[PDB]
Structure 1
């Protein structure tokens, strides 16, 4: 058969094996997650999408998973990010002081993976999966992230940080998961300030990108939720990583 059902890439190779392994590595590495049954976790992950229509997935579908994956993370040490995945995780790799969603059990299990099934059959689809835009938004992957991302932002408190790509077309994009889901599920009762770190890309220094109009847009949004907004440029990304790595070379 010479045609695929969907426009999007199909399931990542060795998906069940890969999720289980990531679960084993995470629960052995993090002592508080040691109470977790990894096969039980996999079972709830499968049962969310297997034998289900990949355009008909719901938040409830993932509720079993969400319960088994319940995790407390330091609420004041949260780093959100939008369109700058690599630097944000390089950062939390060295600090370890701060946590992206990908640093939680659920985020870790799913980071960079694609998955879907078929209706009326229990097979995983290693051929193609629904593209969010060309096929349908309610697909196993898109619904997973939207659900875990909402809870993450719900869990945050005090000062929440967000990395942004200073060279992105729009530095802040209302339509990203950060912009459409996370900004709107921070709890004004618990969050004092959202602080944006705008990462410059070009050669060394530049503008004050915290004056960028999309950033002003983010600011107006967050201020009207009764949360303070602050912003800092990071004019030189690798001095930042020099300093984050070796926090007390006195060039820092």
Structure 2
């Protein structure tokens, strides 16, 4: 894997663009200037072995970086990145991690430290399917946790119902591992949306398999629960990308 070029300039550039122009109406600005955020983030993994990371390294970064999240608007997802983002719609309907300050600064970036100067590898980074679990998930694991700890009201969870190999809810997803257990009592409802991909065999349904697992786990935590499969707004989003699919038929 090839690390992002000019990590620092990209970071600070996204940081300044975000501060001045992004989500102004939707998300609050953070207290720290961009260079203090840079110091906290860099300190986390710099001058270290690329797999000397744990779930605590970026904690000061996230403490600096965390925003209060608008009530009822937080959305979580597993295995349906693209439709959750389209449905969320850049903050118009829901908020995702990539809408928040740290999610937006680091989306799609690739970095790693080294013990030698200049503290980080600008040439080659380890295929993270090589370090332990805790160092692999040290950045986005803490991010997911910091995000989830900030959620309030109803939160929404979008899942893949058409995967014959991967259960809609898994205790060992970032959601199961880091997000769900970090919901505080400010959260009152987990609303699930199951995606039944077009042209595909339906695999999971509300009330059965791993979604019943989830339902019990949510109810055990003193949250309300509900669940729907291809609700109309969602279905229509998928139909625009495949408008002749059988599921997309309109009136004559």
TM-score above 0.5: yes
RMSD: 2.7
Q: Pick one of 157, 160, 175 that aligns with 1:162.
A: 157
Q: How does 1:31-46 map to 2 (within 5 A)?
A: 31=24, 32-33=28-29, 36-46=32-42
Q: Which of 13, 17, 26 is 1:21 aligned to? A: 13
Aligned partner of 2:112 among 94, 112, 116: 116
**Residue 2 of structure 2 contacts residue 124 of structure 2 at CA under 8 Å; is this kept in 1?**
yes
TM-score of the two chains, using structure 2 as the length reference: 0.81
Q: Which moved more, 1:198-207 or 1:77-86?
A: 198-207
2:126 equivalent to 1:134: no
Contact 2:66 2:147 survives alignment (8 Å): no
SS of the residue corresponding to residue 74 of structure 1 reads coil
State the secondary structure of the residue aligned to 2:191: strand
Confirm whether residue 183 of structure 1 aligns to residue 180 of structure 2.
yes
Instruction: Give the 3 Å change call, closer, same or farther, for CA 183–86 of structure 1 in structure 2.
Output: same
Match in the other structure for 2:86: 90
SS at match of 1:164: strand
Q: Structure 1 unaligned segments of length 5 or more: list them.
A: 1-8, 244-250
Task: Go from structure 1 to structure 2 and tell me whether the alpha carbon gap of 1:111 and 1:162 turns closer, same or farther (over 3 Å shift).
Answer: same
- Kept in 1: contact 2:152–2:186 (CA 8 A): yes
The structure-2 alpha-carbon separation of the partners of 1:181 and 1:35, relative to structure 1 and needing over 3 Å to count, comes to closer
Cα distance, 1:123 vs structure 2:
4.1
What TM-score comes out, normalization by structure 1 length? 0.81
Distance in 1 between residues matched to 2:30 and 2:214, nearest whole Å: 39
